[PDB]
Symmetry: D2
Subunit: 115 residues, 4 copies
């Protein structure tokens, strides 16, 4: 599993469940092309986004639909979504965990990169 995303809710102290997200990869014409998508499970995790052969060098963007998550909870959030943009696999294949911690008016994101 070369790319996994974990999302937590800082208000309820719980995984952020059923959070949608879309992964895009920058194309040659400098447009964002759809690469993968999914929703977080009961543990707040999204696995199986991609495979090692498909996940090539490039610039990728992970768009986490945080607005829809807060609104299904009755809260009106500040952000429309949380975006994470990074270059992947520039020095060879790595495993990437993108983690995000969400509040109505704030979020934090970090990456764990393993070889």
């Amino acid at each position: 599993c070369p790319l996994m995303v974990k999302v937590l809710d800082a208000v309820r102290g719980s995984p952020a469940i059923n959070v949608a997200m879309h992964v895009f990869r920058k194309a040659a014409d400098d447009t964002w092309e759809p690469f993968a998508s999914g929703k977080t499970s009961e543990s707040g995790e999204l696995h199986g986004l991609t495979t090692e052969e498909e996940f090539v060098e490039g610039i990728y963007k992970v768009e986490i639909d945080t607005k829809s998550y807060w609104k299904a909870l009755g809260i009106s959030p500040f952000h429309e979504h949380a975006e994470v943009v990074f270059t992947a696999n520039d020095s060879g294949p790595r495993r990437y965990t993108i983690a995000a911690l969400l509040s109505p008016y704030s979020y934090s994101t970090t990456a764990v990169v393993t070889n």
Copy 2:
């Protein structure tokens, strides 16, 4: 000052000085049109981005060039930039401070809305 941006550096415990950023506003055709830009000051703050008359309701994106900041310090960064996408809604007199705390492999952002 209806919109201000403050950037801090979590590695050096200081304001993030000379950080470039661009502000975009969403267009009806689903494209980001340039709205404002600048570079943070010695206090890590960017003021005078916009005026009360120009800052209307809508979806705005702040793209902070974190990669150039870390490269200038000699530190290998994870993200291409830090993006903050938010809705500005008119409900009472609101001033927005967008604040961001930066690390090479992580960032956090929050909004301080006040009257």
Copy 3:
């Protein structure tokens, strides 16, 4: 102002107003003696904690009563308080801002040291 504390609320997107906190300094006998205290203002800031003559090198603890803050808003919090324990070292003229961003089940803190 050699030491200032700023507290923000990540749920309401505002400064954390009327937050009580105590500052302790480590004693030779490994006990925390009271040093200063106060409550954050409408800007979420607590100024005038100490003077340059009193703020000597040492280990200091800032204990922020986050539990009372969340209870006042009607929100069930995880932490009893937020604690920030740090060394103040003399190397050039240093002013310390301790900043904290609060959520019910999470908090983040950073130091902004400047000249």
Copy 4:
């Protein structure tokens, strides 16, 4: 596993490995009594701190020795340690994941509480 701690390094984008920590529980005489301790593994995780029968209602403190972690990496950090203080099991047994993300001048902590 009713209490687990996960620690990440925001500068290197990696688990924080071999981070020591000490868990204390508040006693009747309002002193902190030693409850459990360990070091994070290669994945940045500390499991096996306690058992469900031993982990009773009370106020617990988790002291993560962040200073020693940064110094074994050649960095001089701001904080002496990261402390997390919370009431556990007040409404019956829960499972607790305390997570921390570390920078030299900053850290964030959050809790996931499951039933």
